[PDB]
Amino acid sequence: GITGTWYNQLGSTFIVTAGADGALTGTYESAVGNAESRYVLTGRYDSAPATDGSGTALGWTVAWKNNYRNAHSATTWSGQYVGGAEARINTQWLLTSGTTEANAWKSTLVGHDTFTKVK
Amino acid sequence: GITGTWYNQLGSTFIVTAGADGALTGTYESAVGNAESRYVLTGRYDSAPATDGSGTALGWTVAWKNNYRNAHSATTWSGQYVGGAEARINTQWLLTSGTTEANAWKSTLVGHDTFTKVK
Amino acid sequence: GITGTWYNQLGSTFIVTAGADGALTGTYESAVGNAESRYVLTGRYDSAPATDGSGTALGWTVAWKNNYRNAHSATTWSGQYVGGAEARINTQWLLTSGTTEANAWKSTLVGHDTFTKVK
Amino acid sequence: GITGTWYNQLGSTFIVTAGADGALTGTYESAVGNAESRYVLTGRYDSAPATDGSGTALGWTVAWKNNYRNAHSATTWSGQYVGGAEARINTQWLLTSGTTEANAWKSTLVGHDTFTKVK
């Protein structure tokens, strides 16, 4: 059940809606980008995973811009949905900011975020 | 001019179509995922960047699945479009495969890809 | 107290010995490199951190080679020692394997490891 | 010939001295850490690589602290020495700064650096 509202341990609220073809839409809120606004994501996942155990490998992208606030950056998560009694999404991510050619070494960040359904 | 057909130094062909709202669609071909097939991406970029020099921070996601071949993985690029006379997209990326809980340490890869318009 | 024996949640045993100049020596065991052998690390940390809260930013490197087994790879952790009543080391890492020029896209891995003193 | 003075395309000067056991010492200068000072590295590489083509997988660590200036950070490169007529070191890296628990999401950076012998 990849469709639903996912949370974090930090406090981020991740509302997603999967697709039959393999698309992935929803909204996103609640910092690393910027705390109090509602941002839009899009992404993809494979529709036919393995059945002798695997994770449904997915990923999405949030460009930090809406009608409230612009942060001139973009964040892309890349993880998998681990299936079980306890639903779990384990992701790496990358935050890329808009810099000049001189400051191009400090543009991209990295990290890890772990998602769950209950909060 | 972010809309168009982008290439690599490896040989990957990246056909993209931007949006006025901030969406990003197109196709993708030509390995790291798997060499000879045509894969679908989606992603986002900010619609209002800075004018006293910056890069348009973007990112997209390819789930390696189509009618020809499945690789059970997903790749997310996260970079910026550097504007000038010579158009340039400089990206980091992450390849996340579908593994079990035991092999969860070797699921995610990392790298860097540099894109251009001429080939 | 950065000097001592650190553990993981996976099961890796990390015995380290700090230095007054800023060096960092010890041993390492217990997979991602290869499970049952004893590998050698070296690394550095800054000797004068901040006192109005910070983490002692450190990092080290293990080349997976000893008298028992060779894996033709190297792993570099890069994190910080968060000070408190509960000692904590939070790290990113990179596993770089020895590949040819053709397979140079899949050489480097990435992940995250969280270290503690009690097991 | 891994022992010697390596350069970059940015301008960083990397003087290294290898070891027979597998150690790796030298100095480092010339930004991402901080521009005009001389920093100390340490690292490791495997002493017995493959002969049917491979890269000598290495890695090292610089803690940005000396008698001139402190930056409260650490950088770890993780790459391979590609052998040939044109010597080449291709690395990923991670810059980890000293942050509090609140700003722990923006501590680690990421990038890529490509090293050569001629400048």
Residue numbers in the entry:
A (entry chain A), B (entry chain C), C (entry chain B), D (entry chain D): 16 to 134
Question: How did the manuscript describe this experimental structure?
Answer:
In the end, we obtained a reconstruction of apo-SA at 3.3 Å resolution (with D2 symmetry applied during the refinement) from a final dataset composed of ~24,000 particles and a reconstruction of the SA–biotin complex at 3.2 Å resolution (with D2 symmetry applied during the refinement) from a final dataset comprising ~45,000 particles. Compared with the biotin-bound SA, the density corresponding to loop 46–51 in the EM map of apo-SA was missing, indicating that this lid-like loop is flexible without ligand binding. We performed this 3D skip-alignment classification analysis of the apo-SA and biotin-SA datasets separately, and found a rather small occupancy variance around the biotin-binding pocket among the different classes in each dataset, demonstrating unambiguously the lack of biotin in all the monomers of apo-SA and the full occupancy of biotin in all the monomers of biotin-SA. We noticed that even after the careful scrutiny of the SA particle images by 2D classification to remove all obvious junk or bad particles, only ~20% (79, 289 vs. 378, 987 for the apo-SA) of the seemingly good particles contributed to the correct high-resolution reconstruction after the 3D classification. Based on the location of each particle, the 212,105 particles were manually divided into two subsets with 134,606 particles in the clustering regions (subset A) and 77,499 particles in the uniformly dispersed regions (subset B). The maps from subset A consistently demonstrated the correct features of the SA molecule, whereas the maps from subset B were of poor quality.
Different from hemoglobin that consists mostly of α-helices, SA is constituted by mainly β-strands.
